[PDB]
Structure 1
Amino acid sequence: TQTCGAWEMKERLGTGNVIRWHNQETGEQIAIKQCRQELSPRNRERWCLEIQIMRRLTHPNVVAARDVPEGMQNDLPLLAMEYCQGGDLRKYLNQFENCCGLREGAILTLLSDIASALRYLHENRIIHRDLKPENIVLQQGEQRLIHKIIDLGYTSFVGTLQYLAPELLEQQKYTVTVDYWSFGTLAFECITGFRPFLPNWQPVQWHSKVRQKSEVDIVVSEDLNGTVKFSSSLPYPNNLNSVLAERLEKWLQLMLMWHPRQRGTDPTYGPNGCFKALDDILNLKLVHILNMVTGTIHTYPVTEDESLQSLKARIQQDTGIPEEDQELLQEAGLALIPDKPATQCISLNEGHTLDMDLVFLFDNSKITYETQRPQPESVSCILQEPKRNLAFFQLRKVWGQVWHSIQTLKEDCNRLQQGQRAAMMNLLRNNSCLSKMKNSMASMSQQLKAKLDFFKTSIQIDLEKYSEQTDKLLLAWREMEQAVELCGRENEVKLLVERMMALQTDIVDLQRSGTLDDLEEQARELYRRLREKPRDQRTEGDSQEMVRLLLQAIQSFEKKVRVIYTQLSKTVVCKQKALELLPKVEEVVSLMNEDEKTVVRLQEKRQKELWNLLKIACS
């Protein structure tokens, strides 16, 4: 469609226009901003000034300027930039599985990358003014997706106002705190899936309502009825952990602050201390413990110095399980190493979650495990009245939330299976040593039976041929014979082989044996269809089909969870029996070893006593 030697023109990246160019020879990719339009002298200057700013700036989180390919013939120059393979953040936010916000890993890398870029811009005295998901592009790094800032210019109308700091509608002059507002609204949208303050509301009405919020309010929303509610708390559903939700909630209060001068001011780090505040949150080292007793995830911020014993004492307060009874296991069934620090649980990209470095907690005191999430306000609201007609935009929100609820049921249920598999892995690892010991015991018993048989044969000859050639020796030898009768732990080994054999049966029955996975795929496809519905077909309707799926998923979940706990309590009773048998086997192998030592000595002594007879006779 257009070429420049090896440089061939590709698809439009967005709208003058931005188009991708690919080098046929090197495989190199570039983005070119072009204007075929005729501009006013001020906007002409504005265009040139941007190319100049870009050429000056150099940062890992700011799109790099590139040379315009030689021979790339309005009169205004082109803006050649690096091509970011990941695409814009709006595209990511629009992925159907991100309707209720992005994953935890994706949020931490966003926050980090955009805070670092904003810091560079502001220190080089560049104020963005139009920061939004459309102005954030993702580049493919070596191990993760890197967020970069674009458009450093120097629904439709209501659309443009969506990330603007309130002062911008009110006055002319502004400060860096305009970019805090934008970063905060943006960040919130990535956590929750929607903007903090009454999205798509008309400016006059928006301004009048949001003005009324308190210093601690980070969300102003309209329910289905349509009550406007203000909140200090980060909304649910979100894919963040307990601690991160709590800590990002308070950081957002700094950023979504109505007061323009007070915005970004940290109580510790003073004005513009919002970047140092986030640094603390991002540098936190978190440990996630799943209490198998209750099924709740406990998150603990740990220090590099913090010992496993300190963490155990902290788990103790939230679970009621004493340090001594705490069995802490990981994915593969290994118990946590006490010499090592609490940070041992920690194993950083967009695919990072709490599930990655998750530890499963079991109570050694428990013999049996009895089975023990609250859906958002809008979901429980539609559960009560599923036949209610909702406008398409309202349908889109509750359906995404219902789908998210089911995904959570599925994910929650799989974490419990992972916990049961960790306990099974530990059991199989113990059963392995138990088998290795059983075989040694079996082998030692057979070797002992053999040596005893041989000694019994040997001594019988020696007793016969002695009496034939006619004291203290005869009585001593007869004691040797009755003494070796008492050793041999055949009957004790017998019983332990029965137990060890009966145990391995229960274990093979445990390892030798969904709809909840299916109900999620059903809900996902139903939500997919709603969002892929043509604009003319977007009308009013019921949530009957969706609410049907959630109820079936709840029912399926509790049924599936019952079975997980039945197998867990079966696994733990096997683990007990195993731990009970190990010393019993060890003890019998010890006894047998002494029996062998005794047979060996008694044989050596008798032989030496016979050569002694031959001495006396040789004189």
Structure 2
Amino acid sequence: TTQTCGAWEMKERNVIRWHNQETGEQIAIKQCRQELSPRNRERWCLEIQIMRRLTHPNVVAARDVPEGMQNLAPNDLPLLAMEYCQGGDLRKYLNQFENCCGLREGAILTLLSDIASALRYLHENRIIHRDLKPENIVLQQGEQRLIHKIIDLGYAKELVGTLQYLAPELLEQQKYTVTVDYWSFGTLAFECITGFRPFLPNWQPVQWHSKVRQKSEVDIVVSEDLNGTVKFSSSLPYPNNLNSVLAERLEKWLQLMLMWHPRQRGTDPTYGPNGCFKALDDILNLKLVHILNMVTGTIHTYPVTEDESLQSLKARIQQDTGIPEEDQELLQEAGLALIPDKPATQCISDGKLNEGHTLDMDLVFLFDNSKITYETQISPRPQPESVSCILQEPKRNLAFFQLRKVWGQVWHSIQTLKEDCNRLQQGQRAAMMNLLRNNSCLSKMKNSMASMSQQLKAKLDFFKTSIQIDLEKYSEQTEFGITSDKLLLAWREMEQAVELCGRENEVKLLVERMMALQTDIVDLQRSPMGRKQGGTLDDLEEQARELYRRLREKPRDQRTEGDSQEMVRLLLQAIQSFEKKVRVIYTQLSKTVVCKQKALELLPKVEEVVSLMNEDEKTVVRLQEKRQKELWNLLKIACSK
């Protein structure tokens, strides 16, 4: 039973979509009810007129009513058209099995940058949404990145529904400023980072208002643990997908966004009242650089200005880690050395803040020149209170909704450990790439030095033979020619000077040392790394995700309580295999760095050897030229008689 009004065909569901099968425009018409109250009818007309004014790109825009659609209207009031977004609401993205513990870093950054710049324009036109939920935010597939648009607006005074995203001012029905949106944003952001609602997970608003009035402004997360004890924590809970500076700045911003007093909410102590837009813009504009210290295997995030010198940031890293700037070795994904004075902010040269943020490529690995071998242990990863409490007793039959949370946290921890292993493996591979480059250069220099040494040997033999024949023939002209002991001594002096030289033995020593070095280099070049070797960790991650999906597949009638023995077993197995693999990674890393140092030790040996053999060849040529000059001068003088 499908009905159309021309070319536009009706689609399924407040707002209903109409797709054109000849022009191709999917316009969403919002239908109005038939029984309207006078004040509500006037407000509906006001909303109709207001929608034509707002045309922000980061929010859904109002489109023209098709010609001939007012005729098929039961009520005398015009329905409004909109743009259909193929993406869908943010709620489905949040409920995905991969984003159970919050979205990726890039997704959160794009969400903030797309929502704040639209909310500023909404507040500029004296329009307040007064309601904001993940269901209103749709992820429209843009030209380059996904754009966060806002559908299904509400009401507003010119300057009542059903949902759990309520600000306290909606409960008190008191004089509210625009800050009611800010709060509704902040809570949302929390579930976008950690995965759960910040204030009272699935608790009724009745005690929620009291527990919000009781909490201090610094405490951001209000939750009860496995026992059932209320807790107010000021720090951002784990496990989030953010780095250090991101977590700290966003925790301060969240404290600035979650306040009880309406006029004090959003009041930034730097950008005046309601200056959260500029604070968030300053947070987003911060060029963060990730450095992976391989000695301890720790990731450090640093905020770098547009023109912060490389040496100053290296000094900051030296102060933090403890390795001086001289012994610092900064390497890229393929054994690429960083620019030695132009700032290393080119490590994110793409600079398009990819929606699928990949902090495993935009990081720079740091190695030490002083240490010869590296340690295997890099310490494990921290775990939240619930995860530790369920690890101490895996046989705790907790509720279904608590088990969902803790199992998701365990799966996220396993995936994080796998990612850390991949990053360390990539760092060692990059070190090997740099070593291979140096080895190729040293092989070319070895060939050049061997060529020079053999040429010198040939020239010495030829010169010695020539001078020996000259000395033999000199004694046969002494009977009737012109004889002297003046220039006879010069030939003997050169005869001793040729014996003074000769670097064949040192060259041979260097050749066997270089040959041994290259053979061990190729011996550890054979070792494969790219294809994750003993890829047990990925299969363990697959088991964890399969178990998590199986838990979320049982219908509501099978949602029974049980123990978490199997997932704890999987986590312990993953930890053991992770350390076992990291041990081999660091063994190969030490094997690589020792040979790199040996190559850099053998470089100046050959440098000085060739710099000496060059002058040796020069002297040989000079001696031959002088002997020929002496003979020609003697002939010229004798021809005068």
TM-score interval (norm. to shorter): over 0.9
Q: State which drifts further: 389-398 or 151-160.
A: 151-160
TM-score normalised to structure 2 length? 0.90
**Contact kept in structure 2, 1:127 and 1:179, CA below 8 Å:** yes
**Contact kept in structure 2, 1:105 and 1:349, CA below 8 Å:** yes
Residues 547-569 of structure 1 show CA distances to partners (whole Å, capped at 9, x for unaligned) of: 11111111111111111111111
- CA RMSD between the two structures: 3.1
For 1:615 and 1:592, the matched residues in 2 are separated by 35
- TM-superposed CA distance for 1:108, in Å, is 1.4
* 1:45/1:457 CA distance change after superposition, 3 Å: farther
* 1:228/1:322 CA distance change after superposition, 3 Å: same
Which of structure 1's runs of 4+ aligned residues deviate more than 6 A?
155-159
For 2:125 and 2:444, the matched residues in 1 are separated by 68
**Contact kept in structure 1, 2:127 and 2:159, CA below 8 Å:** no
SS in structure 2 at match of 1:230: strand
Residues 150-183 of structure 1 show CA distances to partners (whole Å, capped at 9, x for unaligned) of: 2222299999452211121112542211101100
* 1:379/1:2 CA distance change after superposition, 3 Å: farther
For 1:71 and 1:464, the matched residues in 2 are separated by 121
SS in structure 2 at match of 1:322: coil
Number of residues paired by the alignment?
615
Q: State which drifts further: 323-332 or 408-417.
A: 323-332
For 1:394 and 1:106, the matched residues in 2 are separated by 26
TM-score normalised to structure 1 length? 0.93
Q: State which drifts further: 67-76 or 107-116.
A: 67-76
* 1:533/1:484 CA distance change after superposition, 3 Å: farther
For 1:25 and 1:429, the matched residues in 2 are separated by 60
* 1:539/1:304 CA distance change after superposition, 3 Å: same
* 1:314/1:72 CA distance change after superposition, 3 Å: same
* 1:587/1:36 CA distance change after superposition, 3 Å: same
* 1:529/1:608 CA distance change after superposition, 3 Å: same
Q: State which drifts further: 124-133 or 301-310.
A: 301-310
- TM-superposed CA distance for 1:570, in Å, is 0.9
For 1:177 and 1:95, the matched residues in 2 are separated by 30
For 1:10 and 1:481, the matched residues in 2 are separated by 104
Residues 474-509 of structure 1 show CA distances to partners (whole Å, capped at 9, x for unaligned) of: 332233233223434222221222122111222222
For 2:196 and 2:418, the matched residues in 1 are separated by 24
For 2:618 and 2:9, the matched residues in 1 are separated by 87
For 1:26 and 1:611, the matched residues in 2 are separated by 100
- TM-superposed CA distance for 1:402, in Å, is 0.4
For 2:396 and 2:34, the matched residues in 1 are separated by 49
**Contact kept in structure 1, 2:311 and 2:341, CA below 8 Å:** no
| 1:68 corresponds to 2:65 | yes
| 1:583 corresponds to 2:591 | no
* 1:198/1:304 CA distance change after superposition, 3 Å: same
Q: Which has the larger radius of gyration?
A: 2
Q: State which drifts further: 128-137 or 438-447.
A: 438-447
- TM-superposed CA distance for 1:423, in Å, is 1.6
- The equivalent of 1:48 in structure 2 is 45
For 1:173 and 1:230, the matched residues in 2 are separated by 27
- TM-superposed CA distance for 1:345, in Å, is 4.1
- TM-superposed CA distance for 1:353, in Å, is 4.3
**Contact kept in structure 1, 2:293 and 2:367, CA below 8 Å:** yes
Residues 318-374 of structure 1 show CA distances to partners (whole Å, capped at 9, x for unaligned) of: 111122221222222223223213534443132224434211111211101112311
**Contact kept in structure 2, 1:159 and 1:200, CA below 8 Å:** no
- TM-superposed CA distance for 1:67, in Å, is 2.7
**Contact kept in structure 2, 1:311 and 1:342, CA below 8 Å:** no
For 1:454 and 1:51, the matched residues in 2 are separated by 103
For 1:352 and 1:277, the matched residues in 2 are separated by 22
* 1:23/1:454 CA distance change after superposition, 3 Å: farther
Unaligned ranges ≥5, structure 1: none
**Contact kept in structure 1, 2:130 and 2:154, CA below 8 Å:** no
**Contact kept in structure 2, 1:445 and 1:488, CA below 8 Å:** no
- TM-superposed CA distance for 1:39, in Å, is 5.2
SS in structure 1 at match of 2:281: helix
- TM-superposed CA distance for 1:11, in Å, is 5.8
| 1:369 corresponds to 2:374 | yes
Unaligned ranges ≥5, structure 2: 478-483, 528-534
* 1:606/1:187 CA distance change after superposition, 3 Å: same
**Contact kept in structure 2, 1:50 and 1:152, CA below 8 Å:** no
* 1:468/1:242 CA distance change after superposition, 3 Å: same
For 1:599 and 1:118, the matched residues in 2 are separated by 83
* 1:158/1:20 CA distance change after superposition, 3 Å: closer
Residues 274-332 of structure 1 show CA distances to partners (whole Å, capped at 9, x for unaligned) of: 22222221221212111111111121112223211111111111111122221222222
Q: State which drifts further: 192-201 or 499-508.
A: 499-508
- TM-superposed CA distance for 1:124, in Å, is 0.7
Q: State which drifts further: 400-409 or 355-364.
A: 355-364
**Contact kept in structure 1, 2:521 and 2:595, CA below 8 Å:** yes
Residues 59-95 of structure 1 show CA distances to partners (whole Å, capped at 9, x for unaligned) of: 2211122234445566554432223343221121112
SS in structure 1 at match of 2:60: coil
For 1:435 and 1:19, the matched residues in 2 are separated by 72
- TM-superposed CA distance for 1:467, in Å, is 2.6
Q: State which drifts further: 441-450 or 146-155.
A: 146-155
Q: Percent identity?
A: 99
For 1:157 and 1:524, the matched residues in 2 are separated by 51
For 1:454 and 1:36, the matched residues in 2 are separated by 110
For 1:392 and 1:157, the matched residues in 2 are separated by 47
* 1:222/1:462 CA distance change after superposition, 3 Å: same
Residues 399-439 of structure 1 show CA distances to partners (whole Å, capped at 9, x for unaligned) of: 11000010111111112112212221221221121122112
